[PDB]
Structure 1
Amino acid sequence: AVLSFHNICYRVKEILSNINGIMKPGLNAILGPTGGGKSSLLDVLAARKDPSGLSGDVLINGAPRPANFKCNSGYVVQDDVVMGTLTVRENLQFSAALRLATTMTNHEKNERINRVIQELGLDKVADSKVGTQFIRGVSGGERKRTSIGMELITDPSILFLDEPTTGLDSSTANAVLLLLKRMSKQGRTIIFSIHQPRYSIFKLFDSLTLLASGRLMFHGPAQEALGYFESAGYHCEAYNNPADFFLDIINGDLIEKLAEIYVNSSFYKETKAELHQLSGYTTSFCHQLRWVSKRSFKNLLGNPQASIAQIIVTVVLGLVIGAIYFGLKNDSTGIQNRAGVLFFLTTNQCFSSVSAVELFVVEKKLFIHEYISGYYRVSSYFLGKLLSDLLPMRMLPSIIFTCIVYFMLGLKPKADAFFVMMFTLMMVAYSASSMALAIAAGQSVVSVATLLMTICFVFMMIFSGLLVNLTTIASWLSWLQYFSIPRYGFTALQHNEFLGQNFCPGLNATGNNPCNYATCTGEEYLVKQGIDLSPWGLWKNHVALACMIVIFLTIAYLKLLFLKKY
């Protein structure tokens, strides 16, 4: 299975102008600087770029590239897109779990996992965690092998590598490059964009194609490259590295004048003659939903440095709130006291979900690469992570909260009120996380995602039934009370709270009482806040919060789905 390409015109400014040539089923390479069209060529030959600006055709052994070309052809990304806090065994099981289980059994596909672990030579650390900047594990030289080995389980005919020696301890860099020479013995087409090979792997090159500023310099084998520029006009004598002299022509010891000599060279004309003669999902839904939810859950308690950080600051917050309000009295200092704390617990939960923005952006390149390679549909990924790293995570600043705070105060001595308060505190937390997830899903940096959300949770903090008394502002702006998350929190936390008790000792003020502006009963206080006293009015917020969840989640589901993934 060979690749070939003819007259590629690519506009965003034409970035890939006049590229054409063939490959060989061996070890191909893309050379040149990073400023040129070197990296942009390999993306278009791997169908990574969009076909909008594409004009030329890529012919694999004469046939055009089919729709599932990206399903069968692995593309190793430049950075470590391996999961850092996972075992290398189950790291390799994951990519095997979504591309292959349509027909074959589990114990049928187990053998090719054990096959690719030995031809990679990765049985040595096969039961170790990979390692990241947070936690250690397997060394960085074998992190690239895990990226390469991950894309070998489904059967490849072409294999791509995006800059495979970017900072790989060059004494260790050669071993993986010999392995690709060892991988090409089966017939794997290895097209990579290598960044400055010195001389060692430069003699083990089967074919090469050097580019500069969007212009083809030269295509040909490495044994034919040394005799080229000596017959072109710039000499490369002794103590002059070949792969670094070939870029010295565009340093200027002009930009197109070197590229013309290749047209009337004895390399390009016979590639045109062979170009002219060749010119004339897969896995079930519930199988996908399990496995991606298995990964992030294992990723969560594989690195429990930021998960248990939220638990401890919650348990210490609840004890501190419990130590502050250790027994709340029904005196005149009750209303300022119990509406104060029940304000605080919602707007904590609305604000402590600032750290829900790091859910789709710390693994965005883990999402774009795994979606476009064909692992799963988007709604499988999105439903997978929510019930794995938003549902069990944001369910315990809530049920851990009430049990440590409601018994240290004695808010309302019941069990339904203990069970409705526990319900709504996890309901705000699911909302304002998703609100923070809505305006942060499908972005690259967390920077403007935190600044935009935090200034949005201030206007929600104002309209919350505490700092305003919403009934008193004018109706041309009091419509903004509905566009606020913790108001639905604070109302629901108050409606189950002011129902039977009297903040008026020594007197009773039900219907016959003089001397108003008293606010003795809480039901008198609630109409000062204008809260309706119906039992519908309690659950009116929860459906309003539940419909706040759905519109915020599907706009996040839209934003990942309509993401420019090329």
Structure 2
Amino acid sequence: GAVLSFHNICYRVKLPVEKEILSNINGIMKPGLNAILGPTGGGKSSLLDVLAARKDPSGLSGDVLINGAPRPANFKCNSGYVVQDDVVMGTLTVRENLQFSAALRLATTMTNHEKNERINRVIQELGLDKVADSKVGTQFIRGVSGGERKRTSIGMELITDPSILFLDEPTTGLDSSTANAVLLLLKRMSKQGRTIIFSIHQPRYSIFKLFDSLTLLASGRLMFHGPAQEALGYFESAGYHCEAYNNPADFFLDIINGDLIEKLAEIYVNSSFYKETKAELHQLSGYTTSFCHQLRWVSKRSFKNLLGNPQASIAQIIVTVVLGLVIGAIYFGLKNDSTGIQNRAGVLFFLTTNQCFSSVSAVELFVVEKKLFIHEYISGYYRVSSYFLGKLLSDLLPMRMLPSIIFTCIVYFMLGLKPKADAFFVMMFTLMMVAYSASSMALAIAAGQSVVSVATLLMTICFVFMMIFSGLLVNLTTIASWLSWLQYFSIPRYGFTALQHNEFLGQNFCPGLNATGNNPCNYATCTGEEYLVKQGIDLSPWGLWKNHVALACMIVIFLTIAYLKLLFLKKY
């Protein structure tokens, strides 16, 4: 098996206040089962991220060396890593998660039969054969238990057959017998020859008896490294008395807590386990798949997540149908009189600002899947471009095509707007474009963040500063010229101007008029063009289509900003 042998690791971060969180740590990890103990504030998870190259090589100041050689560039694609909180797809089943991982991690050369036999072998080694085709589970659907979720998360990284297998906290978040079952599974894996390296948090003695090698850390300093049976005898030789009926790992943490660390670290420097470790270390020292493949599998997984998550996709269509029927019931039969201007301008304003505010629910998209994106980009399933285009083609495109089609098909013929063939399609296309543009601004603000609330609030602030310049509330010509340049940044202004220019052309709003008051008395606003001029809207068809080309340019700019915020994200 592999022998991961790290020597003289110094590590430091910038919080810019610079601080070392690993001081001077060396150790050898045999084929077998290696554990890392310590407090939460100690460097256990930090050293585990360092050995798997999950933290940046800028702060790292020592050689990490496997089997006599430094770590190659293919190492992250070769060595599996299992996150603390499970990153499995809750809506997909256990076999389709392994199908996804086998499709992206393994080569394109292999047969589907070979990958299916590999998945069957991995799901046989885990004991997930009873639940091989059930869903993993979310809030709405009941699913598989938590220990078998953890076995699924291990089995996703077992597909590529890793030589070294890392594990961040496999015990925590679980109950006791569940944790014992997971660790017995890990011991059955380690007896084969696979080198398991894991960090944990306050284990039991039934856990602690299984360990092959131990590494204790405290406040960034190495406290012990050797065989795990030898550790209690070493701390008896240090002078700390162990009491009867006490867990030795709890005794190890009780040494740290003080019933000092610079006093206790130097005691390990004067050990027999330290000179032997240096005597071993100085002996040793002195993409895969194409683009369309990744886009196809990412889009397939995200669309299957969209189907398997019923409520957040169905309820938007239900509220769209209900609100379309309500707007068809309120504005039913739009007349041509003095109320016609107010009713038509009001319903077009409601439809555009409805599209904008209903596109706030795409903040959720790149924020819920953020840790899964980071883990699967470091583990090397996909590029950022394929993730981005697949998740636009999967979750953004149909869930913004369907509500605008439903709004136009419902509120068009109940209201009785301009009864032409092409005005219907221009209205449908304008609602679709304002939906895409508002949702693209949502993705531009929301991408690369961890919380939903600040991005949602900022979307709503931007929309209430856009709807002032939309054109119904204020007249755009009466804004002062040092402030009227902000009307070009606003998506409802383009959607609403396009709908007003679509609908107000052939209409007359003074019945029985036939020039009674001599082109009626200069204050009438009778024909639709006379309304559409004094709003500041052009009458030429470029005055229609420049709104759509402005929306298309805002879609392109906002999706490019979202892509750059995903690409320039701190992945480590």
With the length of structure 1 as denominator, give the TM-score of the two structures. Answer: 0.98
- Residue 446 of structure 1 deviates from its aligned partner by 1.0
CA distance in 2, matches of 1:248, 1:80: 30
Deviation of 1:68 after TM superposition, in Å, equals: 1.1
Shift in Å at residue 309 of structure 1?
1.1
Assess if the C-alpha contact under 8 Å between 1:509 and 1:520 holds in 2.
Answer: no
Cα shift at 1:512: 6.4
Question: 1:183-216 CA deviation, whole Å, 9 max, x = no partner?
Answer: 1122111000011111012111011101011111
User: Closer, same or farther in 2 for the Cα pair 1:512/1:285, shift >3 Å?
Assistant: farther
Q: In the superposition, relative to structure 1, how do residues 266 and 417 fare at CA in structure 2: closer, same or farther (>3 Å)?
A: same
Q: Percent identity?
A: 100
Does 1:462 pair with 2:468?
yes
Secondary structure (helix, strand or coil) at the match of 1:501 reads coil
> Structure 1: how far apart are the matches of 2:91 and 2:112?
24
508-517 or 211-220: which moved more? 508-517
Deviation at 1:101, TM superposition (A): 3.5
- The answer as to whether partners of 1:218 and 1:262 remain within 8 angstroms in 2 is yes
Instruction: Report Cα offsets for 1:437-463 as digits up to 9, x if no partner.
Output: 111100010121112111111110100
Distance 1:250 1:510, change over 3 A: farther
Distance 2:232 2:555 in 1: 64
Q: Distance between the aligned counterparts of 1:74 and 1:509, measured in 2?
A: 82
* Distance of aligned partners of 1:230 and 1:516 in 2 relative to their CA distance in 1, 3 Å threshold: same
Measure, in 2, the Cα distance between the counterparts of 1:512 and 1:382. Answer: 61
8 Å CA contact retained: 1:88, 1:125: yes
* Partner Cα distance (1:398, 1:560) in 2: 28
Answer yes or no: is the 8 Å Cα contact 1:510–1:521 preserved in 2. Answer: no
Measure how far apart 1:301 and its partner are: 1.2
SS in structure 2 of the partner of residue 294 of structure 1:
helix
Q: Secondary structure at the residue paired with 2:354? A: helix
Q: Deviations over 1:272-293 (max 9, x none)?
A: 1111111121101111111111
8 Å contact 1:509–1:521 — kept in the other structure?
Answer: no
How far has the Cα of 1:105 moved from its partner? 2.1
Deviations 1:505-551 (A, max 9, x none): 11146996140111100011111111000111111111100000010
Equivalent position of 1:524 in the other structure: 530
* Number of residues of Structure 1 aligned to a counterpart in Structure 2: 566
Q: Please give the alpha-carbon distance, in whole angstroms, between the structure 1 residues aligned to 2:357 and 2:148.
A: 40
Query: Residues 385-425 of structure 1, C-alpha deviation per residue, up to 9 Å, x if partnerless?
Result: 01110100111110011111101011010111111101110
Paired with 2:516 and 2:141, the residues of 1 have a C-alpha distance of: 63
| Inter-partner Cα distance in structure 1 for 2:158 and 2:245 | 39
Looking at structure 1, the residues matched to 454 and 536 of structure 2 have their Cα atoms a distance apart, in angstroms, of: 36
* More displaced 10-residue stretch of structure 1: 126-135 or 266-275: 126-135
Query: Quick one: distance in 1 between partners of 2:444 and 2:550?
Result: 17
Distance 1:140 1:206 in 2: 26
In 2, Cα distance between equivalents of 1:546 and 1:226? 68
Deviates more, 1:511-520 or 1:25-34: 511-520
Structure 1 pair 511/232, CA: closer, same or farther in 2 (3 Å)?
A: farther
CA shift, 1:140, in A, is 1.1
Q: Please give the secondary structure, in 1, of the residue aligned with 2:25.
A: strand
Task: String of CA shifts for 1:42-100, please: whole Å, max 9, x gaps.
Answer: 00001001111110110001100011110001110000110111111111100001122
Structure 2 distance, partners of 1:462, 1:232, is 74
Deviates most, 133-142 or 27-36: 133-142
What SS does the aligned partner of 1:468 have? coil
Deviation, 1:167, is: 2.1
> Are the equivalent residues in 2 in contact too, given 1:6–1:57 (CA < 8 A)?
yes
Confirm or deny: 8 A CA contact 1:500 1:522 kept in the other structure: yes
User: Is the counterpart of residue 4 in structure 1 residue 10 in structure 2?
Assistant: no
Equivalent of residue 250 in structure 2, options 241, 244, 248? 244
Mapped partners of 1:208, 1:189: distance in 2: 13
Residue of structure 2 equivalent to 1:327: 333
Q: Which moved more, 1:337-346 or 1:108-117?
A: 108-117
Paired residue for 1:154? 160
CA distance, structure 2, for counterparts of residue 144 and residue 299 of structure 1: 20
CA deviations over 1:452-476 (Å, ceiling 9, x no partner): 1111111101001111110111111
Tell me the distance in 2 between the aligned counterparts of 1:239 and 1:514: 101
Compute the displacement of 1:237 (Å): 2.5
* CA deviation map 1:239-259 (0-9, x unaligned): 121010001112111121111
Task: From the superposition, tell whether residues 510 and 226 of structure 1 become closer, same or farther in structure 2 (CA, over 3 Å).
Answer: farther
Inter-CA distance 51–509: structure 2 relative to 1 (3 Å threshold): farther
Once the two structures are TM-superposed, the CA of residue 26 in structure 1 deviates from its matched residue by 0.4
In structure 2, the gaps of 5 or more residues are 15-19
Is the 1:465–1:529 Cα contact (8 Å) retained in structure 2? yes
Q: Indicate the SS of the match to 2:177.
A: coil
Q: CA deviation at 1:102?
A: 2.1
The separation in 1 between residues aligned to 2:527 and 2:138, in whole angstroms, is 58
SS in 2 for 1:211: strand
Q: 1:509 to 1:63 in 2, by over 3 A?
A: farther
> Structure 1 residue 377: deviation in Å?
0.2
Contact persistence 1:350–1:428 (CA under 8 A): yes
Q: 1:510 to 1:471 in 2, by over 3 A?
A: farther
2:521 pairs with one of 515, 523, 535 = 515
CA distance in 2, matches of 1:290, 1:70: 23
Counterpart of 2:17 in structure 1 is none
- Mapped to 2, the partners of 1:508 and 1:17 lie a distance apart of 92
**Matching residue of 1:118:** 124
Query: Please, what is the CA RMSD of the aligned residues?
Result: 1.2
**Is 1:403 matched with 2:416?**
no
Q: Secondary structure at the match of 1:75?
A: strand
Cα distance in 2 for residues equivalent to 1:165 and 1:405: 55
Matched, 1:66 2:67: no
Shift of residue 134, structure 1, vs aligned partner: 3.5
How many angstroms apart in 2 are the aligned matches of 1:105 and 1:541? 50
What is the deviation of 1:294?
Answer: 0.6
Is the partner of 1:15 in helix, strand or coil? strand
Give structure 1 stretches of 5+ with no counterpart: none
* Secondary structure in structure 2 of the residue aligned to 1:126: coil
The aligned counterpart of 2:487 is 481
How far is 1:141 from its partner? 1.6
- Residue 22 of structure 2 aligns to a residue in which SS? strand
Please give the alpha-carbon distance, in whole angstroms, between the structure 2 residues aligned to 1:514 and 1:453.
44
C-alpha separation in 2, matches of 1:216 and 1:511: 96
How far the C-alpha of 1:498 sits from its partner, in A, is 0.8
After superposition, give the CA deviation of every residue in 1:149-172 in whole Å (9 maximum; x if it has no partner).
000111200001100011211111
Query: C-alpha displacement at 1:356, in angstroms?
Result: 0.8
Quote the Cα distance in structure 2 between the aligned partners of 1:372 and 1:554. 22
The offset of 1:354, in angstroms, is 1.1
TM-score by length of 2: 0.97
From the superposition, tell whether residues 259 and 465 of structure 1 become closer, same or farther in structure 2 (CA, over 3 Å).
Answer: same
- Which segment drifts farther, 179-188 or 346-355? 179-188
Tell me the distance in 2 between the aligned counterparts of 1:270 and 1:509: 107
Instruction: Map 1:163-202; keep pairs closer than 5 Å.
Output: 163-202=169-208
1:358 equivalent to 2:364? Answer yes
Instruction: Measure, in 2, the Cα distance between the counterparts of 1:61 and 1:413.
Output: 77
CA drift of 1:133 comes to: 3.2
Q: Secondary structure, in 3 states, of the residue corresponding to 1:160?
A: strand
